[PDB]
Design a binder for this molecule. Structure first.
Ligand code: HEM
Ligand code: HEM
Ligand code: HEM
Ligand code: HEM
Ligand code: HEM
Ligand code: HEM
Ligand code: HEM
Ligand code: HEM
Ligand code: HEM
Ligand code: HEM
Ligand SMILES: [Cl-]
Ligand SMILES: [Cl-]
Ligand SMILES: [Mg+2]
Ligand SMILES: [Mg+2]
Lengths: 140, 142, 145, 147, 145, 140, 145, 142, 147, 140
């Protein structure tokens, strides 16, 4: 899943969206705003990171950690052993959260709803495949 | 008659005149200034909402309620059963307030002039507006 | 101040120059391994304390390098919003408090390795602004260590 | 009790305006119908308060007209957010109207707020939940004052 | 020319004024049924030749009205690119050639019903530009009929 | 499928993309360009509409017919009996083309790849549901 | 937030509208005496606790009114720089701590008298932003009282 | 009453309406056009200053004197002894000119509407303006 | 007799406007009081002409009101400098009023001009003396015509 | 000292400088910067208000208190009994500081150096007289 050509599209399109965002904190908060608006039940999962105020330093810091992780993963899509190790590390970090498939699906929808609004060109399928690669690794 | 094509015209022109929230107050003021100039004794009916000072917070809230009432009716012109239920309620809200029957045609004239002033005379259709406003006030007035 | 808004903007601009459209996504590993090489030399810290034992041929260590460069990226990019930056640093601080044998001095050495490698790949780097801002970063990560 | 700021009001008025259908009642009815379905699911007893508007048949003209009135009332209040002196008179007006309805209580407004919070992200693009929550409170608290 | 670039721009602008952000998506049926009412009166064509027999309470006819307003929309919006417009009209022409009892005169009546209803909902409409451009549309749809 | 609230999002977002497009012919051609780039085998299906030259009057006219149909359908999402009739009509028009599920899936991807690049805000799920409503009606 | 940057800008703009080029320097006493009149009524605080016993004919009280309006001016004008504002408020807090019989509730009443008099001379005043920002001011001056 | 806070509001709004010399004529014209529309027989009182042609140099100078008179009174609202001395003189200047008592409330209405039109309805306070204008005209009129 | 030019009028109107207190009478009273103190120092007999306004007590309300009238009259005239047709009617009006005061003579206007020339540089920033002198003459000569 | 006409010039020129300053904190800090640059020995007098860092919240707050006091005094130059009372109050606030004539002279120089750089027109003498009025009242 997420072949070498699909990786080219996703790397290029992430560079043009996240990579070129003038306000990285706002981009990252928007991701979570879309997530909560897609699946209201997800919001409570973030009670440990100041989610009651999405403009808080605490919540913004969480959002930046997440898009930074997306960035570091996208950078390594082509390095199978390295990304597998990194995905396992993230899986460990999410293990105690008792997430389910609907949660990962909602995050995929959020990513794929925010990203194209920052682009002139977007490839839905490649993004679905490479998001699946990441989600499956983190779900563990 | 307030025909299907009349309703289309009135809806579009109302949305232009009222659709942006700022200048809702400007539209309302056009109505009341005109109405009270033509029918000074009408001002007294609004004593509870400070009709002597149309610029007061109390009157301005009343003015914006009136425009919201008109908006409900215009938005529902194509759905007569809903429109009739809206007018039924407006009727209850106007009965036994000592409102003279003459107040309604006066208000209709003031409202039409206000919309006309807002959207411009060249695009305007007085026939459509009169027909449709008369349908509305017929449901409200005794 | 120390690491002023102006200093922060310079540092962010220079980090962006290193990780520009051509280099971002392809150069993190090489930059990161070099940072670790300088760090190990200056700090005397054992490579064995790291995933994959500090072996650049090991995917476990390469993934660690990816995390460290990304963590640095996130902190650096937040330098102009001090309240957000303080929170990022407090999170990193908690993570390192949970790890045996992380010292304040060693955190300083790693921060200075970032600055020194940046100056090696970007000769024009404002070494003073890097010093001030990496010291602010080190103070936050290394708090109580 | 977090304040509905100037910035929050801008966000809410933007979300609201962008989703508004200015010439037709069908969209505002659909919005309100979803809010009421949520409210009545959360608080089954609340439906009885609406017997005067045929709440038992939410697709009826009677109930659809109520939906129009409610969404209108909220539209007027939202549009007054940048003129709070006027807003206060409007909310006092709405409060009096709800005081006149036996059984309507402040607790019901909390349930209504939950219903809007559920429904708005389903009808509004780039919906700003925190700003909505704070400014809905500003409005609802004004209506529920005295009950 | 007849239906010049300038005439076309006026017509497109006026169609857009009718179907503006408030009205587009909600008013097509009412506009369409009115166009058909004027058409039936001027043309003497039997409602029975249409899906749902011209009954405005029938979903089959309402869907026909939706198609006709949309077809008109597509042609009108392409008036400034004559080569594309000619092709749209040729396609519509083929569709009407396959239908028994469509005449050139009747096609003219429908085109003029569009113009007349537009002028009823938009008093300021440029009736000349509408005449010239709807005549160009009618000529294309009605070719050989 | 495609509930009354989802319809609000799709109608609003179509209005803001297609509805506001300065060059409707270009928007419509872009849809088909994305379709062919997603599923190369789809291109040959359009041999009767001058597809060898996507800038031709013939092919542009086809593209405009398609987005005009999308527009007229989106306008009627809330009128069940009317849209059902219109969808049946379109189903008749596509019946002889021997299309398959992969073709409808590829068109959905094209629509959902083009539309959000014209928007500040996009709701992936609502678009998937309402695209499914249309696709199922046309597939017949 | 409560008294956001936006709220602060509105309040500052409205205070500037009251004390504009025509009114600044000539209207402070009248505004101030009116604020005190509303304050005395709402708070039940004795005029005798003030210089000149709250007598508007007394220069000692008029000078007190001048100080209060100026203090309010300085705090209001610093609302967009929260760190500076916090310091101004802490200084005022120390000054009132040194004064017997200043309560937190009374400080609130005076802050609300400022807002109410502003709304009386400036009908368009944003009463919500005034409430939020005067509450922030009252919290600082009234801390521990 | 024309209260201290009323006086503050009237002073500020007057300074906005009158403070720049250009458009003093525009403010004056708003007053006279309104007054003579409502009370046509008033025009005759101004025969010596060419009241038939309000745009004439003679009338315009009169108009600007009137506004200057109002300015003196507004500027002095906070100083009652000076205000009373100003009104005393204005009274002398209006006595035995055959001015009907009704002319004063009419002028007050015209002046308030003119100021309101100039500074905008949203910032306006009719109560303050009426109270303070009534204090002024009470000193001038018999 | 040097002409009060368009440029002079601009200068004078600027100096005058920049020094004006638009909402309060205290500044214009102070200006006029200084002018009168100068006038009466220069021409002791002139004070008697002002017995009807309590000139003997320049701080009286009576005299302060006169000060307001004088500064008002000059303010109106200055503001009419760009519309001389209207100015001429105003100065003719003022002339008639001064003709009605026994003992007021053209020579007094020269002394008044000296008084303004002394006082204006003490109240006006970047005061343009030559433009003031020429345009004050334009005004004063209009009032003093016929006396 | 500081006659009624001089007051007109000073009120007008303060309105045009302080009154129109876009950055009141910067204007006020500049006053103190000029003071310290004129008389270096004055700086230590401000050790209780964070003077070691002139950009501190503490020092900026002091500077704003001072120009606010200048403003409230200038506003009352014409109200003899009121300003006398206010000047006596300020004199009480400065009594324990053991200031000398050179300190008041240096502050006058600072005021009269900053103010005219914000003006098209400045009257040195009127400012000297009205500054003297204030300084004498505060020196006590
Ligand atoms: C597939 C993409 C995702 C990525 C790249 C990602 C990344 C991250 C990162 C980097 C952290 C911080 C780890 C740390 O330093 O402690 C984190 C924490 C967390 N994530 Fe995710 N995540 C993803 C998906 C999700 C989903 C789908 C959910 C649930 C809806 C979720 C829920 C959480 C929670 C609850 C935390 C802990 C917050 C806390 O500290 O209280 N994540 N994630
Ligand atoms: C199409 C025409 C009209 C519409 C849509 C309309 C609408 C409204 C609305 C929505 C209210 C507030 C009801 C409530 O919540 O209690 C109201 C109140 C009122 N209306 Fe009308 N109205 C119209 C015409 C008139 C006319 C012609 C008059 C009299 C000349 C009038 C006199 C009043 C009065 C006296 C009140 C009550 C004010 C109060 O609260 O004390 N209305 N109207
Ligand atoms: C500026 C200085 C530093 C930065 C930016 C930094 C950053 C990071 C980051 C981002 C992580 C990943 C956290 C996670 O997701 O679990 C990490 C982990 C770690 N760091 Fe650091 N670090 C710094 C200094 C140091 C120093 C000086 C030491 C050693 C003495 C150290 C030892 C470790 C270890 C052992 C881990 C955990 C690896 C694992 O088992 O998952 N770090 N660091
Ligand atoms: C911000 C939220 C709300 C708004 C804007 C609102 C608005 C309105 C409006 C405009 C009316 C029509 C008034 C009239 O014509 O008398 C109404 C009626 C009513 N409302 Fe609300 N309302 C809100 C919340 C609630 C809540 C939480 C309840 C309690 C469950 C409630 C219960 C009622 C009832 C029982 C009626 C009377 C229905 C009838 O006509 O028989 N409302 N509301
Ligand atoms: C300007 C003139 C006209 C326009 C724009 C127009 C447009 C259209 C369109 C867009 C369709 C749908 C084609 C399809 O998808 O199959 C259609 C169908 C049809 N039209 Fe027209 N038309 C016009 C005039 C006429 C006239 C004058 C007649 C009758 C004498 C007519 C009779 C029909 C019929 C019977 C159908 C087929 C309905 C069915 O069974 O599917 N049209 N037309
Ligand atoms: C679900 C969304 C779709 C819509 C709204 C749509 C709409 C249309 C319309 C309006 C026409 C012209 C009908 C006429 O006037 O004759 C058409 C023709 C056609 N469509 Fe579609 N279509 C859709 C999906 C597809 C898909 C998924 C494919 C295949 C990949 C496809 C293949 C064709 C072909 C081959 C034609 C005939 C071209 C010709 O005339 O040679 N369509 N479509
Ligand atoms: C928002 C609220 C308030 C503001 C802005 C304010 C401001 C001030 C200021 C600027 C001073 C002058 C300090 C100095 O230079 O020594 C002052 C003094 C004083 N204030 Fe307040 N104040 C407030 C509330 C109150 C309240 C509620 C009370 C009474 C219960 C009070 C009682 C006093 C007294 C007695 C003095 C001292 C007068 C003296 O003897 O010098 N203040 N205040
Ligand atoms: C606040 C209200 C008013 C003010 C401030 C005002 C002021 C003035 C002033 C300054 C003059 C010139 C006096 C002179 O130098 O001789 C004047 C003249 C006059 N005013 Fe008024 N006035 C007011 C109201 C009215 C009203 C209500 C009327 C009548 C309806 C009126 C009728 C006249 C007439 C007839 C003259 C004499 C015109 C002439 O020179 O022949 N005034 N007024
Ligand atoms: C440009 C210069 C002057 C202006 C604008 C001016 C203006 C005025 C005005 C507006 C009045 C009030 C008229 C009324 O209500 O009857 C007045 C009164 C008077 N003026 Fe002047 N004046 C000027 C110069 C002079 C001079 C040079 C003298 C002679 C020394 C003078 C002597 C008087 C007297 C005696 C009165 C009557 C005072 C009273 O009310 O008892 N004026 N002037
Ligand atoms: C003549 C103009 C001056 C004005 C209007 C002025 C005003 C003020 C004000 C308002 C305060 C704060 C009082 C409080 O709330 O506690 C203050 C404090 C102070 N002033 Fe001045 N001042 C002036 C001149 C000077 C001079 C010439 C010096 C010495 C070079 C000086 C030294 C101080 C000191 C040391 C403080 C106390 C700072 C602290 O709290 O530690 N002032 N002044
Ligand atoms: Cl809808
Ligand atoms: Cl002054
Ligand atoms: Mg108001
Ligand atoms: Mg003229």
């Amino acid at each position: 899943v997420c072949n070498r050509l699909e990786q080219i599209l996703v790397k290029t399109q992430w560079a043009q969206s996240y990579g070129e965002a003038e306000n990285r904190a706002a981009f990252s908060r928007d991701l979570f705003s879309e997530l909560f608006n897609i699946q209201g039940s997800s919001r409570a999962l973030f009670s440990g990171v100041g989610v009651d105020d999405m403009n808080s330093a605490a919540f913004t810091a969480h959002c930046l950690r997440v898009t930074g992780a997306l960035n570091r993963l996208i950078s390594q899509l082509d390095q199978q052993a390295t990304i597998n190790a990194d995905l396992a590390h993230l899986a460990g970090q999410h293990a105690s959260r008792n997430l389910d498939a609907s949660n990962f699906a909602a995050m995929g929808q959020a990513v794929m709803s925010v990203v194209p609004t920052h682009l002139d060109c977007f490839n839905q399928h490649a993004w679905g495949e490479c998001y699946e690669r990441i989600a499956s690794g983190i779900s563990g | 008659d307030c025909t299907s094509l009349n309703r289309l015209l009135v809806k579009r022109q109302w949305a232009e005149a009222y659709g942006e929230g700022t200048n809702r107050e400007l539209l309302g003021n056009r109505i009341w200034e005109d109405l009270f100039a033509n029918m000074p004794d009408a001002r007294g009916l609004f004593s509870r909402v400070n009709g002597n000072d149309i610029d007061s917070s109390e009157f301005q809230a009343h003015s914006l309620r009136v425009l919201g009432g008109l908006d409900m009716c215009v938005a529902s012109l194509d759905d007569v059963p809903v429109l009739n239920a809206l007018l039924a309620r407006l009727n209850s809200q106007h009965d036994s307030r000592g409102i003279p029957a003459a107040g309604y045609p006066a208000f209709v004239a003031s409202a039409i002039s206000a919309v006309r002033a807002t959207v411009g005379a060249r695009s305007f259709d007085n026939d459509a507006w009169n027909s449709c406003m008369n349908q509305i006030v017929s449901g409200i007035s005794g | 101040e120390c690491c002023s808004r102006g200093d922060a903007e310079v540092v962010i601009s220079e980090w962006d120059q290193v990780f520009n459209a051509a280099m971002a996504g392809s150069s993190e590993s090489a930059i990161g391994v070099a940072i670790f090489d300088v760090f190990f030399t200056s700090s005397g810290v054992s490579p064995s304390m790291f995933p994959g034992g500090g072996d650049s041929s090991s995917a476990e260590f390469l993934a660690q390098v990816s995390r460290v460069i990304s963590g640095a990226d996130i902190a650096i990019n937040s330098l102009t919003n001090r309240a957000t930056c303080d929170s990022l640093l407090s999170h990193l601080n908690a993570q390192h408090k949970a790890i045996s044998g992380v010292t304040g001095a060693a955190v300083t050495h790693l921060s200075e390795a970032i600055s020194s490698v940046v100056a090696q790949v970007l000769p024009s780097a404002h070494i003073d602004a890097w010093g001030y801002c990496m010291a602010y970063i080190a103070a936050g990560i290394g708090a109580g260590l | 009790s977090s304040c509905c700021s100037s910035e929050d009001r801008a966000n809410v008025m933007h979300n609201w305006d962008a989703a508004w259908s200015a010439a037709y009642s069908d969209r505002r009815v659909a919005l309100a119908q979803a809010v009421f379905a949520s409210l009545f699911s959360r608080d089954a007893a609340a439906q009885g308060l609406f017997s005067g508007v045929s709440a038992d048949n939410p697709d009826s003209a009677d109930f659809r007209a109520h939906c129009v009135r409610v969404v209108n009332g909220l539209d007027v209040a939202i549009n007054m957010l940048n003129d709070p002196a006027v807003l206060n008179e409007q909310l006092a007006h709405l409060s009096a109207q709800h005081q006149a309805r036996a059984g309507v209580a402040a607790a019901h407004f909390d349930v209504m707020a939950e219903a809007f919070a559920e429904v708005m992200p389903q009808v509004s693009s780039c919906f700003s939940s925190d700003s909505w929550n704070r400014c809905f409170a500003r409005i609802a608290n004004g209506i529920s004052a005295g009950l």
